[PDB]
Amino acid sequence: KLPPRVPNLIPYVGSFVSFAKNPVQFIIDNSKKYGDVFTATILGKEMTFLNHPKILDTFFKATDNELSLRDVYRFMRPVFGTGVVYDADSTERMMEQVKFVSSGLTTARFRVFVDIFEDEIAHKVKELGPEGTVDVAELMADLIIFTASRCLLGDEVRQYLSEKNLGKLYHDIDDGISPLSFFYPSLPAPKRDKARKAVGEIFQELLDKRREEHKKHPERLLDESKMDVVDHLLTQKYKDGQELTDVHRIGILIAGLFAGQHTSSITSSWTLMNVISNKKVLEKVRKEQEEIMGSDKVLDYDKVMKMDYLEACMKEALRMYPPLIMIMRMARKPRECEQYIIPKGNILVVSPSVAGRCTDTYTNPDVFDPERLTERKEHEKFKYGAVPFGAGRHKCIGENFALLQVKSIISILLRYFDMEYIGKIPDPSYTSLVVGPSPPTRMRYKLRK
Numbered sequence: 001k002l003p004p005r006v007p008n009l010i011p012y013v014g015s016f017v018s019f020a021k022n023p024v025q026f027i028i029d030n031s032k033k034y035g036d037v038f039t040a041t042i043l044g045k046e047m048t049f050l051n052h053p054k055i056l057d058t059f060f061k062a063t064d065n066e067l068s069l070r071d072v073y074r075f076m077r078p079v080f081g082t083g084v085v086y087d088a089d090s091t092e093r094m095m096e097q098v099k100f101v102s103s104g105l106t107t108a109r110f111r112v113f114v115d116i117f118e119d120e121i122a123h124k125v126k127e128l129g130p131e132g133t134v135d136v137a138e139l140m141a142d143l144i145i146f147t148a149s150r151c152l153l154g155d156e157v158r159q160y161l162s163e164k165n166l167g168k169l170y171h172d173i174d175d176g177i178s179p180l181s182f183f184y185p186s187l188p189a190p191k192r193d194k195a196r197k198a199v200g201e202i203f204q205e206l207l208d209k210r211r212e213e214h215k216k217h218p219e220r221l222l223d224e225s226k227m228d229v230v231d232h233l234l235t236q237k238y239k240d241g242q243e244l245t246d247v248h249r250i251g252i253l254i255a256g257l258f259a260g261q262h263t264s265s266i267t268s269s270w271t272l273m274n275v276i277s278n279k280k281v282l283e284k285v286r287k288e289q290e291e292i293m294g295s296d297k298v299l300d301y302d303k304v305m306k307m308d309y310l311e312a313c314m315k316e317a318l319r320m321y322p323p324l325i326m327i328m329r330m331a332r333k334p335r336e337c338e339q340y341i342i343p344k345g346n347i348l349v350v351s352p353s354v355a356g357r358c359t360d361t362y363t364n365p366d367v368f369d370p371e372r373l374t375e376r377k378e379h380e381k382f383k384y385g386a387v388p389f390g391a392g393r394h395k396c397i398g399e400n401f402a403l404l405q406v407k408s409i410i411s412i413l414l415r416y417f418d419m420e421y422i423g424k425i426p427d428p429s430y431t432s433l434v435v436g437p438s439p440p441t442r443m444r445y446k447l448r449k
């Protein structure tokens with residue numbers, strides 16, 4: 001059989017409307033009507049949703065000529081650049097470029113990354129003063145924007161953030177995209193395209209500076225903890241021998257910073273909100289924090305490794321608010337799920353959000369409650385029963401830096417501040433590509449020494 005279709009409102013538009021209102025309720029809704037697998041027509045596209053953790057093996061283990069990423073995230077191309085990652089000329093090449101990123105995400109570096117978080121948050125505290133209120137979301141994204149850039153690019157980048165408005169340009173790029181672009185890649189976005197060029201020149205300036213610093217200081221290349229992604233990109237070839245071009249290099253740096261920022265900082269936000277808005281949770285985080293700092297006055301990587309509870313909380317926030325609510329592949333060959341045959345051409349879909357709220361796995365799924373993971377080990381039920389970082393051939397290569405980043409930021413913040421949130425925890429806003437908390441998200445903070 002072909003799977004149970006979802007009745008269209010209109011031909012073509014199909015089921016767009018109730019989907020776009022709320023994509024996640026839409027999938028769940030119709031799960032209950034038509035069970036684990038169903039098809040909906042959404043703006044001229046056949047889209048098949050795979051909803052129960054059981055049947056998601058064939059999805060995550062398929063190959064790039066069975067189930068294709070490149071065919072579905074290619075629209076990211078005005079942002080990332082041409083022939084780069086998902087618009088890169090082959091499966092094999094895409095993977096090679098990904099690795100250049102991940103190759104600046106090593107232990108030696110992660111230790112240097114924690115100084116960076118300290119450093120960046122020290123500056124932020126002056127700019128904030130002994131008390132006030134502030135937006136968590138703006139706050140997370142401001143920090144990460146600085147921490148990620150220094151982490152992946154090097155310290156050289158700072159001055160272009162401080163003296164040359166580099167943050168704004170990111171937004172002008174990162175606002176010039178949309179969940180709609182999926183259906184209409186060619187939609188014009190002239191403010192974005194002018195920024196992506198503006199950022200280009202700057203990254204080209206950055207590579208150009210870096211090339212001579214490898215002349216003036218060649219020892220840099222032996223020290224494994226001053227080797228950032230620019231460095232790896234300047235001294236690797238592809239496996240087949242061929243050099244990279246700067247415009248590939250630039251589109252990778254950019255692809256990594258995008259990855260590097262939006263999912264992280266939404267996750268911080270969701271997390272801190274739930275932590276400080278629940279006294280029992282916040283005791284244990286502070287109990288854990290205090291034991292682990294002991295006599296020590298600032299953070300290090302060992303310490304952050306040890307933060308098991310704060311980590312369960314981050315995870316618990318990812319179960320409830322994964323920022324990538326839909327994972328997608330295009331079928332290049334017909335595919336068999338359950339008793340059905342999902343046709344070639346279709347776009348298969350899996351949703352960490354729906355899974356985060358599937359009641360076989362998780363009990364009272366609407367309650368932030370890190371104990372469900374640490375103690376009732378609920379996530380361990382099914383093998384794909386918890387998927388905020390994907391799984392299989394394309395599982396997130398950023399997972400450990402993410403965790404390092406969110407835990408360092410929250411832990412350092414709680415050192416400095418008593419903080420409390422201001423009203424109900426918001427709902428998720430389905431307006432962006434990386435989903436996040438509806439604004440505003442306000443909190444009172446007061447210093448502590």
Ligand code: HEM
Nearest residue numbers: 259260263264327328388389390393394395396397398402
């Ligand atoms: C902080 C929360 C994060 C979440 C929830 C997240 C989530 C994901 C997910 C679900 C995927 C799978 C995509 C798919 O299968 O279609 C993925 C892939 C990826 N993520 Fe992340 N990510 C996070 C942070 C990061 C960071 C910090 C980096 C890099 C700095 C990163 C880089 C990537 C890359 C390069 C891939 C592509 C993997 C591949 O093509 O094989 N992510 N991420």
Ligand SMILES: C[C@@H](c1ncncc1F)[C@](O)(Cn1cncn1)c1ccc(F)cc1F
Nearest residue numbers: 073255256258259260263324326396433434
């Ligand atoms: C394709 C993109 C994405 N995928 C799915 N739904 C919405 C999206 F925006 C994403 O997977 C997000 N991502 C994953 N980890 C961090 N960010 C991604 C991957 C690689 C990359 F180099 C940049 C990048 F955005």
